[PDB]
């Protein structure tokens, strides 16, 4: 049972760059396996995910509301701005704006969403406040992608990012229909195909988002489990590899394939 | 039928790899090592001698006692039988080191003391082998590593901690000679990480190819 760690370990080796990665149960969130679970790694889009929660937990606090419509004006648009870029003219409710942030990794409704919550700082004190006092977001899309080595800004552990969405996806954090929304929204995924998704069998359940920066960094944060239900929280990061998107991105489904073997 | 284990950082405390970390396994040996670290606490707090010499009888012999037995006449100092106990995993010389702290619950205690609440021991040897005499891969590597950095015990003893240790793969150093594993890796007399290992179960074999699959999985603090 090793056997998926030493996958990793390969992976670190065919990068010639850091990989980490932790498993957890999700029912009693204890830790199953990992790898560097303590090293800081990018989030890059993946932290889109922890946005969405503020943004729902603020729902759910009467302090936004899910049909409220955001206008924003071209100046807005930052590259990679799928959902965001066809409509300037009606705009798009919160709802829409963290469907295209989730689901289709819109770089321009991220930003839009911080705004609506005070920018990264507000994103981070949330996290703060849910016990999370490692993963900090400190930059807007397309900066916080960069992933400068050495540098701490945008940054996770994949041990504090698992236990942070294992939080938001159970327990009481936030309502029914809100967590039910959020992996809603991860299950409705179409930008990680790629990933985990290329090694999941027939008939699981997956709930995730990928991310992707400059400087070779990728990851993914997922919810997944055999027969239709998700029983475990997988995290994977990687930066600093010159290796192309393709390889990376044929790393972690490797990884996947491993972890879906030995389940 | 069981298998969890965790190699742990020294300088960072950080976690490098884990499987299972925390499911509960019998300590087995692996108690040894603590059992030494209470006693050099005791040294030093001026409450104990290395150099101390005690004679012991032939009443006080069970299984797996490879230095004692010889020594029924002259007796061994504390060190020598923390030596013994570690390095050759000597049953007798294991019980005579936990009647000069006080027993299992004071050894249990030392433990509570130092932030460990999971890791128990209850019996002497060699019933300890048998939820009693416990921990989990990350509780046992957590305790080693505070013995072994900053704090808890002065220069001194720290470095006599190790030396025990470092008196399966040819890099680990393994402090003894159903299991528990020990092993610090890492330039003599300073290691840099350690590994703690257990498995229920088994075949020699198999464990073996087990064991080597866990080594193909050790890494370090990336440079
Ligand atoms: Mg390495």
């Known amino acids: 049972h090793p056997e998926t760690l030493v996958k990793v370990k390969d992976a670190e080796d065919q990068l010639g760059a850091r990989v980490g990665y932790i498993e957890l149960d999700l029912n009693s969130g204890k830790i199953l396996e990992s790898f560097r679970p303590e090293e800081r790694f990018p989030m890059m889009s993946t932290f889109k995910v922890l946005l969405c929660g503020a943004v729902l937990s603020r729902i759910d606090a009467g302090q936004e509301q899910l ?153 993914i944060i997922a919810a997944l489990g055999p027969d239709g239900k998700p029983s475990r929280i997988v995290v994977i990061y990687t930066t600093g590899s010159q290796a192309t998107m393709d390889e990376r991105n044929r790393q972690i489904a490797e990884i996947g394939a491993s972890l879906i073997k030995h389940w």
């Not at 066809?86 to 705009?91: A, E, F, P, Q």
């Not at 996290?127 to 400068?148: C, F, K, Q, S, Y």
């Not at 996806?169 to 990933?195: C, F, H, N, Y």
């Open 67 to 219: 049909g409220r419509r955001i206008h924003y004006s071209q100046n807005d648009l930052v590259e990679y701005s799928p959902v965001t870029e066809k409509h300037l003219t009606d705009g798009m409710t919160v709802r829409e704006l963290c469907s295209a942030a989730i689901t289709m990794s819109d770089n321009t409704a991220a930003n839009l969403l911080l705004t609506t919550i005070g920018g990264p700082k507000e994103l981070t004190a949330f996290l703060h406040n849910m016990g999370d006092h490692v993963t900090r977001l400190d930059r807007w899309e397309p900066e916080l992608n960069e992933a400068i080595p050495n540098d701490e800004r945008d940054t996770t552990m994949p041990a504090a990012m698992a236990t942070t969405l294992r939080k938001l996806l159970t327990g009481e954090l936030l309502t029914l229909a809100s967590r039910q929304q959020l992996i809603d929204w991860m299950e409705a995924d179409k930008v990680a195909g790629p990933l985990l998704r290329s090694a999941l069998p027939a008939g699981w359940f997956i709930a995730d988002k990928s991310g992707a920066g400059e400087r070779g960094s990728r990851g």
